[PDB]
Design a protein around this ligand. Sequence first.
Ligand code: HEM
Length: 397
Amino acid sequence: HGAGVPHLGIDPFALDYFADPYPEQETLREAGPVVYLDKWNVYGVARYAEVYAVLNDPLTFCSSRGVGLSDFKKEKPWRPPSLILEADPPAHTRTRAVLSKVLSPATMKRLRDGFAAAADAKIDELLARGGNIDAIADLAEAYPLSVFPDAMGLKQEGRENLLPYAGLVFNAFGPPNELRQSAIERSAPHQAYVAEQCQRPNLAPGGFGACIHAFSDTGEITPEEAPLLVRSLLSAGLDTTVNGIAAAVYCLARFPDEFARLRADPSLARNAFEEAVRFESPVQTFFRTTTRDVELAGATIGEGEKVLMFLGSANRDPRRWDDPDRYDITRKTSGHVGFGSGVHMCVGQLVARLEGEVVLAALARKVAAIEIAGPLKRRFNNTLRGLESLPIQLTPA
Ligand code: HEM
């Protein structure tokens, strides 16, 4: 295995790596376009060129064998494969089409005012207590926990267990380590509870959930698939959105001159969030599995091989980005892989962007200055990058 390519001892699932990932991500890029990780016996690609290429060759680098370390072809799935994320065309085309229609631009346009109003109120609220708050619990998590479940049609009370439930999702794409084991145990007590809220009788009319269920009535999807697709949105959208808003606030808080540009021109809100996604990519990695013997950037990769993609690294590859390590809210961000690329490119990106834009717009208008006011605590996850705590001080406009 790994014949003809550079072998490395880098551990992409170690907490030491998660705590300070950039130096090693650079090592991965400089070693070659294709490397082999001896600690896990899997191939890896960290440059923008190859990551983009692989993501856009869904036939060759499939997702139906799992986007995690396990090969669902060779091994009986230890967890049920996602009917959307871990499906290849044409199956994927069918379930994707439903979600794509439900999370359309027209839908976002209808939700915009409500999302903005909630954002403005949240910021006024935070300022009222004083600027001294935790950007994670009080904003990165609080804001989406309000508007996202609302748009989904989930009940108002008991949202306290959505994150505990959602923590399993992306950790499950990693090996059976302590992070994985802890997320499973933390999620267990809420599994049945959250699944129940995704059944048709429990969804508020008009929300994402109810609209998805309507597709059961026509035949596009079965009554059994419907609640699973609904739950997939929650799973795929909670930690990612929290980490996304967290990254944007973290970036603007650490680089005051960029927040100054934003305040001077609030219309940069959407791009400041997009740049935050490129710079501090919520979804750092995940796998694809080869379905045939292939040639990739000079390397020979056999069929049935797991390939680990580093989206964060691709988003900071100097071969593609000028001054990659600089957070620039006016940067031309088009092309970054923070939401992936190709047939699987985040079907929920418009929702995520709406939320992010709206939060940063409220900040740009209501806050005069932002500063980190205490020790930062990073949230460790097998495939995601995020913060557990970020004390900051918001100065009123
Ligand atoms: C900052 C926010 C977000 C980021 C950075 C993000 C990133 C991603 C990435 C990188 C993928 C690709 C996985 C692959 O190719 O295997 C993905 C897929 C997906 N995401 Fe997002 N995500 C975000 C928010 C959301 C939200 C809020 C939702 C729910 C509305 C969501 C629903 C999905 C779904 C359903 C897929 C699978 C699409 C398919 O397989 O066709 N995501 N996301």
